[PDB]
Amino acid sequence: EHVSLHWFRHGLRLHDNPALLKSLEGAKEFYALFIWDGEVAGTKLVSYPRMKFLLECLKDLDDSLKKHGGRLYVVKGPSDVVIKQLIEEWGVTRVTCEIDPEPIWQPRDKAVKDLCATKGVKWFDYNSHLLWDPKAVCDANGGRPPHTYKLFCQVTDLLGKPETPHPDPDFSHVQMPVSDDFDDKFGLPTLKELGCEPECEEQEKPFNKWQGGETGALELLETRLMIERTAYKAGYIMPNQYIPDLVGPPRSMSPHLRFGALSIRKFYWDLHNNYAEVCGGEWLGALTAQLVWREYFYCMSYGNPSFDKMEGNPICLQIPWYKDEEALEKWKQGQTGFPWIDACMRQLRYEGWMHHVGRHAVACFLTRGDLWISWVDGLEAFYKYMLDGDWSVCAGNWMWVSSSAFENCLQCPQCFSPVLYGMRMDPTGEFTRRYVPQLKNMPLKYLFQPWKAPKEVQEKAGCVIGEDYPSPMVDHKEASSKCRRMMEDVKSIIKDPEVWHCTPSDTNEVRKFCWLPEHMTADQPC
Amino acid sequence: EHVSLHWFRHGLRLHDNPALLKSLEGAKEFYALFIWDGEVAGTKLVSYPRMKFLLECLKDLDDSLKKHGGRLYVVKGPSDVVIKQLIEEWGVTRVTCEIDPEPIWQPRDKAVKDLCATKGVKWFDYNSHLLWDPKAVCDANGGRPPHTYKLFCQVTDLLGKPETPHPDPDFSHVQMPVSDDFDDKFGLPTLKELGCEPECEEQEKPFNKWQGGETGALELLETRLMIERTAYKAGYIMPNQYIPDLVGPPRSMSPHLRFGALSIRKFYWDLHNNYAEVCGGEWLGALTAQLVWREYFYCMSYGNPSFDKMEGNPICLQIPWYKDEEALEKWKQGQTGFPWIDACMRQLRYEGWMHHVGRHAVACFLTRGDLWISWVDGLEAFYKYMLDGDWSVCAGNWMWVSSSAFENCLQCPQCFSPVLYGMRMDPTGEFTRRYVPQLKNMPLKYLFQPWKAPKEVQEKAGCVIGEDYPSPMVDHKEASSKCRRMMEDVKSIIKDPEVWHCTPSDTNEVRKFCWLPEHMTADQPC
Ligand SMILES: Cc1cc2nc3c(=O)[nH]c(=O)nc-3n(C[C@H](O)[C@H](O)[C@H](O)COP(=O)(O)OP(=O)(O)OC[C@H]3O[C@@H](n4cnc5c(N)ncnc54)[C@H](O)[C@@H]3O)c2cc1C
Ligand SMILES: Cc1cc2nc3c(=O)[nH]c(=O)nc-3n(C[C@H](O)[C@H](O)[C@H](O)COP(=O)(O)OP(=O)(O)OC[C@H]3O[C@@H](n4cnc5c(N)ncnc54)[C@H](O)[C@@H]3O)c2cc1C
Ligand SMILES: [Mg+2]
Ligand SMILES: [Mg+2]
């Protein structure tokens, strides 16, 4: 005895969706809706790659719904008017949705609820995007979010464990009306009208291909689980990670987690059950350690709309930065003069995805390594091009890498160098040569230092530095010393080391974060 | 109206076994048998690792049979008497088996058939170990086996395609009698009585762990197929292989193929069906190119008992080798003085498995690179320690790498060097340091050349060359020139380049065989 409506904003899936399950029980009619308003799902500041991903996900969702005998409605316009129009037209009595924990989505929702309060329309919301409730974690640690990963783990180890996934829905006993001339009015838009077209030939035909949806997410999860099972049988339980693979398929699910095409609880429990089936029945929490950084960065933004800025944000230190547009433009385009940085930036601009080590390298190069430019300026590029540009996680990582004044392990000019780090992470040079073809014939000895090669080598390789490939934009030795002095001044000004701010816990945490050995080794420069 | 007996020698499996399926139709009783005679399945010249693998496979087979209500009989003694005893005791009327294509297993079988001819006992055999019949291939190319891989492919492309796998058996309508006190008389032996015990502490606790059986083979096949599916979706169809992974799990099925725990036809067809499901319905023969080298080397031994020797073998060239026992013992133990060679040899002696590049490197070092010692001497070690020491494939690979006088690409001292090749295949040095702990603290600069380091570096690293780690056993520059001169003399003596002998087809085949680029590159020494 209800006419229910489920609103799709995130969580574009049908598995493990309690809010959807609640809209089918005691329901005479059912409608599925998505509203295109220009701000939902990071559409305001976006580019071609992630638009393709979003459209593919929506098409997959509609195709999945067509099996049970239903369609997905897409409407263009403000939510506060679209909802009212649909209520007055269809005759809706109940609206169900999933919660958006970020503070920038709150005033949107508060407007709808009030409306439903003045028309006798029930409202239902359920949190299925995170493992723990941010408010409970904040209350357990006084009234402020934890500022350390170890403290966050300690706090969450007392609240309990996540809940198991829910079953799948059933549409057999519910009517799902569909209007005539549906594809002409409630159909899905196209990139041709929205104004997003490829900016270069590399976007049209990238080296690595991505597909959005839910079936691909489930297949990737199955492949991940069986790879781990085979590794466990071989004898590899949580081994040290030192050699990243940059020339093969990524096999990543972060873009799917961002949009909600895969459940976090399902992944969490599948990992542990897979481990227990093979080995004994002892609990090992190190398996799901990566999934806890995501929650640690999500819960930190609770109650702070200025979490993406340096001014007015109480959990960030104030640091005097510089502003030069030429350097920033060179960094964004990929004309810095260091092949390791340029390759990663061009990969981001073409495909929209990058490995962790590259992101750390480019962030350190921009902020506290050589140039001394604010992280707010570089965060915009990641918001614009990344496939998984979460509003809170990216800003949290930027503030973690930079602005940590009292951590001296991140200020070393030898370990975090745009030459030695690239040599370590790409001994062969195939990744560098793939995205910088100008240095295809350059010997591996001078591949990362093209300006130290003689003229005969340049002529033979067909790359004269200064005409075919730009000269370096800065001297690392000189820039590093002045940046170190400037940060030492910041430390002197901020006397107390125990201030409340986002920072790493210890040095080993940094070394593991950056894929480097903990103890001293014979291959450690300074 | 029969009492059938299936004899297990190879093909220790229940899936895709036509001979087994034939012993169940029209049968009143059924017996499964394995005879331990001291020569079956490479038991005469064997060590602890492969014995463990064989025993695990037999235990898995017995456990699988116990589900349907049957056991596996194991008897110790000569086959020609055991078969007769069992025929006179049980009352057998039909014997079924699988064919062993190698010529060393023929006189064993010819004795049994004759017996069955004088007692009214039917005999049935079926070839399920190979994809093509060696006799048909030999007849299609005159009366001799093809001596080139391209010629073998050309010949086999006209015979047709392999047959699809057969169904699984059923034991419901067949009686499977079991005797009392079974575990006391027909039980499985143990390594404790056979005389195989670990020779060192590294055998007891190896770094990589192996398990024999059929379930593991099927799981490995599933993992392989889904990895390939994901790679195809990403956009990687038959890419160039240049970076081997030596610090992770092997994920190999060659030992299972050797003993017959996995079918070759099933793998062949699963690969192609997996490819067709994702991509279009066009045939691509490059997918199963590795499975054809195995058949090429198997069919070459047809009609030649001396295929494992240099004297009396018509498909091998006669070359004057040297004989020094000290050098051979150093090569076998792993005291050569070159860490790249020692690590691979110690890995073989501990675990029993090695990557292709290491096998090629050590074979070239022994035979035609530096020492000039016969391949027959080194083949014995591989027969003794390898988990997949096939009688014909290993000898064929040895004769392919060595004795190819007219192929000058394999005679280059720069590309196939025990220093540069190791640097190329192990840029980090983790694999080398895992099996040569004496050089754990040695800098990566001198890791592959410990004798060129100063004394202070040796003292700091705690490795004085000559006392803690042996000095090099030979000078590569001098050895290479004399070996080249000696092989040039062989070429001068053997005038005709078109002699009938096992040899590579072209230079690109060698370069791909050894995981090296085809065209010239800036990182090519000579
Ligand atoms: C400057 C910078 C910005 C980043 N921005 C993002 C972002 O917007 N979104 C994002 O998901 N990751 C972000 N990361 C973390 C990291 O770059 C990605 O999580 C990485 O690409 C995951 O790849 P993977 O799935 O193969 O790793 P895996 O370890 O195989 O994936 C496990 C999962 O754990 C989570 N995870 C792992 N590391 C982190 C981390 N440091 N912070 C948060 N979650 C993590 C992700 O959901 C990931 O899918 C950023 C890192 C840096 C240095
Ligand atoms: C001196 C020497 C001796 C060798 N002895 C053997 C041996 O006794 N048994 C053996 O199976 N391989 C042998 N090989 C080939 C090679 O070393 C192994 O096939 C390799 O370990 C296969 O690993 P993989 O399964 O990961 O390779 P994959 O390519 O992933 O395996 C595909 C399959 O193709 C077959 N195959 C691949 N290459 C060859 C080859 N060159 N010759 C024959 N079959 C091949 C194997 O059955 C293998 O399982 C030898 C090579 C050399 C240089
Ligand atoms: Mg992932
Ligand atoms: Mg294999």
Author numbering:
A (entry chain B), B (entry chain A): 31 to 556
Question: What do the authors say?
Answer:
In the marine bristle worm Platynereis dumerilii, its light receptive cryptochrome L-CRY (PdLCry) allows the animal to discriminate between sunlight and moonlight, an important requirement for synchronizing its lunar cycle-dependent mass spawning.
The purified protein was vitrified in liquid ethane under far-red light conditions to produce cryo-EM grids of the dark state. We were able to refine the subset of particles composed of two subunits to obtain a dimeric structure with the PdLCry subunits arranged in parallel. As we did not observe any asymmetry during the reconstruction procedure, we enforced C2 symmetry in later reconstruction stages, yielding a final cryo-EM density map at 2.6 Å resolution. Our map shows an overall fold reminiscent of that observed in other type I CRYs, with an N-terminal α/β region (31-161) and a C-terminal α-helical region (243–524) connected by a largely well-resolved connector (162-242). The main dimer interface is formed between helices α8 of both subunits, with helices α8 running antiparallel at an angle of 42 degrees, flanked by interactions mediated by the connector region and the PBL. Apart from the differences in helix α8, we note unique dimer interactions involving Tyr266 of the PBL, especially with Pro279 (PBL) and Asn238 (connector) from the other subunit. However, the sulfur loop of PdLCry has an additional surface-exposed Tyr352 that occupies a position similar to the terminal tyrosine in the type IV CRY ClCry4.
